[PDB]
């Protein structure tokens, strides 16, 4: 709870870059816990921790979407602190997302049933923290997409 | 006619006597005469193209002055002995340049100390390649030049630090250098048309630093982006680091030559450009 | 360049009185002894004024640096003779102890 | 006059290139004399601190006769 | 345009005359340091020698 | 107090014909003094430097910006007092670098005198490219247009 200064780092592999989880080391925090990244008085962002055996104790790994959302790079001082949600008024029950192809040089017109997408979305992004306007990337049938949280409902 | 006789003739006389040779006085006029023989010897060794016993002669000429009253002209003779073996290949000169530092540093003469403390790093990098100690002495001497606030001597040290922090590859410290020196320069008309060069030097130092600090350090340093060497920095950098964010090296390599068409590239920049181009390429595979 | 050329004038201010004490303290020492191409055409005429201002101060900075180098020609000789005088005066003054 | 349109392009790009060549020599010139201004700063040290030793020493050697 | 080309290329050569100057600039900037640095100690130590002198002959 | 230190110190440098600091510390007086509070000192200082600047064959090119500083200080003056310096000064106006001193002025005098802003501001719309503007010049720009506000702003 004290909040520890950490250094925004780079996501280890490409698997965890698709999870939108603050990848960390098993030696500091644990996967499942939630944290609030603090960069300035007017920048408080909330991430999901996801341990991984290739993170150096005392550094937090972030993916490009998080860094391209939180404006973070490999090597600045940030304060990360465990944050405990309020389940009663913060559990997601209906959430709108603006979806779009991540790679502009991979654009197709094939149909992808959303009914399968929502099911795979909850089967991969479960127990995660999502804020309004947050952008991330989803891998549907070996296809990268660029999600964008538009609205959340409790 | 050489001084090999002068050295031995004054070496007969350099005895620390306990006899009638002293009497009541020592050999004070005698030892000044002796050190003058050593002075004349050490000069004509350099006159005789010797370069190896010559700086040794300056060493000994100063050595027999160290314990008398004054290490001072003996310290300048150590500076001269540092100027002795420096032209030559032997490393004896650096030791004498230490001796000068722990006389001038030891005495309050940080100015001349910083004058040759930089030349030591010029030898540890150019000649006697020990470049992390060269850089530690550029940095230490720049600390001294900022001690007396002589700024651009320290900045000339900091380029040899920072410019050689690129191939030593601590980019995090390379960008830690050009900020506090160049944001101090927009008030100066002395360097303002140069200051944007330094925030190309700050900006292009990537370890793939893809934050908008590169999009913001260009702004805190308030900088008309329609400046026409910032056209050679800022929107240059836009094409250089948007194509990396496009993951597309081809128009990158065409536009870096388009920069070459309007301002030719030099060694430190070109090497860091092929460096960051490696980072862009190794990112565009995956 | 101008403020540094008059900085060299304050160099002259130092050197003269140094050498004045040092043509003197040697004697005190022995006393001690004892329709847009036309817009381009307008840009060309802007540049025709530019090259005039260029060349005028180009010739002038030639004269300017030549003046500062003859000022240096003064400094070198007088400061170097005075370098000889300081070392002979210091060692002569010390060799008259006792 | 496509000859003269292509030359209105090409020769005048060479005109900017020539001014770019002298511009290279001039940014060299001005930043060089800039950099020299720091040796002038060390003069500013060694112009009167030199006097601050010398004139101050001869204030006591001339008065060492006293 | 070509009249201006000739004029400007004369001025390229005026800058080349500044390049003819700049070696004569920089070497002299060097040697004046090469004297001032050596002048500093001879200037510095003479007051100390003066102190060594004048304690005796009052 | 520092400007008094420059003032008395430049009085000493004046009385020793160390003309360097004699002009310099006066420039440090006037450049801040004019904007903050002292007005007749501005032109009196930049004319005292300007005459002996015109004198020496070394100095008379530094006089261009010195009489620029004398001119563009307006002292709650709407007039062509800068043009009084024009028909005073040895400009030799076929030297065009003083047109960035006074043809600048020959626009903006009648822009300020005809209380017009889209010609006054246009002067720096074009002059910012052909001369980089430091803090003091733009503060004086804002100064003369505060006189424009006092001419216009109800």
Numbering used by the authors:
A (entry chain C): 1 to 154
B (entry chain L): 8 to 293
C (entry chain H): 50 to 83, 141 to 204
D (entry chain I): 191 to 256
E (entry chain J): 32 to 89
F (entry chain K): 140 to 293
Give the original sentences from the paper that presented this experimental model.
The archetypal Type II AAA+ protein NSF (N-ethylmaleimide-sensitive-factor) plays an essential role in eukaryotic trafficking through its disassembly of different SNARE (Soluble N-ethylmaleimide-sensitive factor attachment protein receptor) complexes. After fusion, NSF—together with several molecules of an adaptor protein, SNAP (Soluble N-ethylmaleimide-sensitive factor Attachment Protein)—binds to the cis SNARE complex, forming the so-called 20S complex and disassembles it in an ATP-dependent manner. NSF is composed of an N-terminal domain (N) and two ATPase domains (D1 and D2). Here, we present higher-resolution cryo-EM reconstructions of the 20S complex composed of NSF, αSNAP, the full cytoplasmic regions of synaptobrevin-2 and syntaxin-1A, and full-length SNAP-25A in the presence of ATP under non-hydrolyzing conditions.
Refinement of the class that appears to have the best-resolved density for the entire 20S complex (Class IV) without symmetry restraints yielded two reconstructions of 20S complexes (FL-20S-1 and FL-20S-2 at 4.4 Å); each reconstruction reveals density for a 20S complex which differs from previous reconstructions in several key ways. Most importantly, a tube of density runs from the SNARE complex to the center of the D1 ring of NSF, suggesting direct engagement of substrate. Regarding substrate loading, both FL-20S classes reveal a spire in which the N-terminal end of the SNARE complex is positioned over the D1 ring by two αSNAP molecules, each of which is in turn bound by two N domains. Critically, and in contrast to previous studies, the map is of sufficient quality to permit explicit assignment of the four SNARE α-helices and thus the determination of the absolute orientation of the SNARE complex in the FL-20S complex. While both FL-20S classes show clear density for the spire, its orientation varies by a discrete rotation (if viewed from the D1 end, counter-clockwise) about the hexamer axis as well as a slight translation in the hexamer plane away from the split in the D1 ring in each. In the first class, protomers A and B engage one αSNAP, while protomers C and D engage the other (left). In the second class, the N domain is shifted by one protomer counter-clockwise about the hexamer axis, with domains B and C engaging the first αSNAP and domains D and E engaging the second (right). This difference results in a 53.2° rotation of the αSNAPs and SNARE complex about the hexamer axis. Finally, and most important, density consistent with the N-terminal residues of SNAP-25A runs from the tip of the SNARE complex to the center of the D1 ring, where it assumes an extended conformation at a 61.0° angle relative to the plane of the D1 ring. While it has been previously speculated that SNAP-25A is the SNARE complex member upon which NSF directly acts, this is the first direct structural evidence of such an interaction.
